[model samples]
Target: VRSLNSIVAVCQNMGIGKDGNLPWPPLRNEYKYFQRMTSTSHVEGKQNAVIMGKKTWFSIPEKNRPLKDRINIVLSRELKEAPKGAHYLSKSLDDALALLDSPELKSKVDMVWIVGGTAVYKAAMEKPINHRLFVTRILHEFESDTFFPEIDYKDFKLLTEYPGVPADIQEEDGIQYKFEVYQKSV
Candidate 1:
């Protein structure tokens, strides 16, 4: 089975958002979390790619489109053309795997991260995953219309966690958060 991992920038409540925007003020931090996790440096020369549904891609601010320096792959059953500066994978998850398993992408990428808007995360988690890195903010809630699915504790094992505030990192509504990593349970 392919290793289907996830990297989410979420609140402690696991709220994804309503109407396509991050529901909390900590979006800047979430963007940073995306940058740090998907950095090409994370896996040496092997590229770190992000797969998202069309709505999730559209929700990104215009300036953040094409997630600079990483491969942005969009999933859609109806999209005929890829967004500017992004690769289009227009099939189901199986087709996405076929493309990802191709010579060029497969050889260059170590893992694929499913970034979300609820639906994508749910589908991705149904596969065999290696790791999931979550940025969970403490003591905050949003008026959310969407939510990431609850992860069963039995499905994952904690790998690592880090607690610290970078001077450049801002908390969501003054809510503190820590970084956590989990690996799939055997």
Candidate 2:
């Protein structure tokens, strides 16, 4: 079975980005949390896969392109080749998942992570039964051009605490945010 996870941070208005960049100042602890969560694998000797949209792929600085220690899969309908440093290029999310299922990657990948752009997040929210959302709720408002897709609480239950997830609210740069997890109900 394939497991898909998403890691995202949203402000009070559900804004995730502005001008193709993060809307708020860097929250160091939150950034570290993201790196650790995505890089760590449950299975020894295995890595996780991060699937992102082409625009999202470009948003990262060139030096950070492949995002270390994880398989980077970028989805684009127009690109003919994978971006430099990306491990794979896929036409769609389904295509990415299929690639993960291939024998060569099945054992090497422990989980699938969805890093996003607006459309990609919306797609993941539909029929998200196999997905888990790792959300950082930023308690501030910012002017933004991009927003995170709304999640239906009826379909996903917010967990008070989860393994390897910190339970206390984190404060950085005067912004108070907390990590939250939502699991799809069986």
Candidate 3:
């Protein structure tokens, strides 16, 4: 089997989010970081895929949820039909994998990224994934109900930590964050 891959997101406290929204405001630096990370240039012509939880899918702004030019798969026990622009809807990660394992999907995409709503990240990180990118802010913090699971440093190694805005990006509750990437230990 091909290796699994993912992008894990967390906050300064390694928090994923409060409620369902991103804990911080829209900083130009963060937006540009996002664009650079998810852009077609980064993904190339490969059919990128983001596997997320149902709540996470709903949490995204309508314009951004089923991301453009890439296949978006939501793992919902309830969702039956594909959302606008989504390639398909799957009930669980395994079902989603079945789709990815297809010759069609394999032929189209070079890699698959597991975007999170908490639970999704937990599942994807435990597997034999190749890479894990994290956005860990250094200064700002928030009170959150949902969170990305704490990762065992032994399971992965620091690959890169990109510098974020030198100062905090004040938005929703005076929050700031930085971006970091990691790779699973082979």
Root-mean-square deviation (CA) per prediction: 3.4, 1.2, 3.7
Candidate 2 overall Cα lDDT vs. reference?
Answer: 0.88
lDDT of 2 by residue, 95-149 (tens): 8878999999998999788889877877777854577999999998999999988
Of the candidates shown, which would achieve the greatest lDDT relative to the real structure?
A: 2
Count clashing residue pairs per candidate. Answer: 0, 0, 2
Instruction: Give each model a TM-score.
Output: 0.82, 0.96, 0.80
Q: On residues 41-153, what C-alpha lDDT tens digit does candidate 1 reach at each position?
A: 44677777788888888887878788876678888888788877676655566677777888888877776777875777777667764556454543466677788787767
Ranking by TM-score: 2, 1, 3
TM accuracy, model 2: 0.96
Better of 2 and 3 by lDDT: 2
How would you order the candidates by lDDT, starting with the best?
A: 2, 1, 3
TM-score head-to-head 1 vs 2, winner: 2
- Give the range of the ten consecutive residues with the poorest summed lDDT in model 1: 161-170
